């Protein structure tokens, strides 16, 4: 079963949770079209040129637009960008570990 790539905007539901094992859990809400769809996600450097982080959640998907999705990721130490969704209105979250 193939799913479309989410084209629309995402919103952070609550404050990003930090786990004791050096990971972060981001709870997002989809505002766009095409659900069920894959959540575009990437942890990058501040220059947005290299992939630095690791996604822990296997294939983040919006099952229903009305239900938020928990995304677990492992950011690198120091400064990084959490990039959620495609442009326009792409979430670009600053993160410091």
């Amino acid at each position: 079963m193939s799913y479309s790539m989410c084209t629309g905007k995402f919103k952070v539901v609550k404050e990003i949770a930090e786990t004791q094992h050096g990971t972060i859990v981001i709870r997002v809400q989809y505002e766009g079209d095409g659900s069920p769809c894959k959540i575009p996600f990437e942890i990058m450097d501040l220059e947005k040129r290299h992939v630095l982080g690791r996604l822990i959640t296997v294939n983040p998907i919006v099952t229903e637009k009305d239900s938020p999705v928990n995304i677990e990721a492992e950011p690198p130490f120091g400064d990084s960008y959490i990039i959620i969704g495609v442009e326009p209105g792409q979430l670009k979250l600053n993160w410091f570990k």
Partner: antibody
Framework: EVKLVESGGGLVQPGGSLSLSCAAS????????MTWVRQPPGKALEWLAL??????????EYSASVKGRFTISRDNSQSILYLQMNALRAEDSATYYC????????????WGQGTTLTVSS | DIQMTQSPASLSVSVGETVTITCRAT??????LAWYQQKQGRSPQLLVY???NLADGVPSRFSGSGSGTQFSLRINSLQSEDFGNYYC?????????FGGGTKLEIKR
């Protein structure tokens, strides 16, 4: 079960107005995005307008070809989709289809039989 | 905006042969792509959605492939009922543009 029946097609003078309707049945109307697609004789299909479901606040989108002239609307009590067409021109002559989208606007899974519009003097 | 180009414009293929038709997007659309069939004097019908999923009631002889900018529709051991027009459509940002179409005709 799922059925879409368009009506309202006919002959209109250039600059005139016409309203098309699409009677929907066999599904929960408010749960689905609805669309209008047209096809001029011997030409390709053209997406014109969309109307979102209840969850998305029934918002609309239009192609640049019809923006400002056409209005998509829905009667959620009667499960009817409408297309209000103003300032009609010869290039609006086509078969008009009303469609249901499968995944929140994506993939036109059900189409009506179509209704024909002719814009001419 | 993203434009959709289909190839070939027309083709004649015999019953029982396998056919592949292609669709190209001007920009990356991942797998947000649909294929439709339209027979003489009838409404278009959904064949493939999300580039590879078969729509309800579509025979398994149909198969969609591709991700990004290049897509293919394959018909294995094609039948007389498969002849007609084929359109691709993207589902990225609006407008959701259709390709110009490919006319599949019967070789006899």
């Amino acid at each position: 079960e799922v059925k879409l029946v368009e009506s309202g097609g006919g002959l209109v003078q250039p600059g005139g107005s016409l309203s098309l309707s699409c009677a929907a049945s066999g599904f929960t109307f408010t749960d689905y995005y609805m669309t209008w697609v047209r096809q001029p004789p011997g030409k390709a299909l053209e997406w014109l307008a969309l109307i979102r479901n209840k969850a998305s606040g029934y918002t609309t989108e239009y192609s640049a070809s019809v923006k400002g002239r056409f209005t998509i609307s829905r009667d959620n009590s009667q499960s009817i989709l409408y297309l209000q067409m103003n300032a009609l021109r010869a290039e609006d002559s086509a078969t008009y289809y009303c469609t249901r989208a499968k995944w929140d606007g994506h993939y036109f899974d059900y189409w009506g039989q179509g209704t024909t519009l002719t814009v001419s003097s | 905006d993203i434009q959709m180009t289909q190839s070939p414009a027309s083709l004649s293929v015999s019953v029982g042969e396998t056919v592949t038709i292609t669709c190209r997007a001007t920009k990356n659309i991942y797998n947000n792509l649909a294929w439709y069939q339209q027979k003489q004097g009838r409404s278009p019908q959904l064949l493939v959605y999300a580039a590879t999923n078969l729509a309800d009631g579509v025979p398994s002889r149909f198969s969609g492939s591709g991700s990004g900018t290049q897509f293919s529709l394959r018909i294995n051991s094609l039948q007389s009922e498969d002849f007609g027009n084929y359109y691709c459509q993207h589902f990225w940002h609006t407008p959701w543009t259709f390709g110009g179409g490919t006319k599949l005709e019967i070789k006899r």
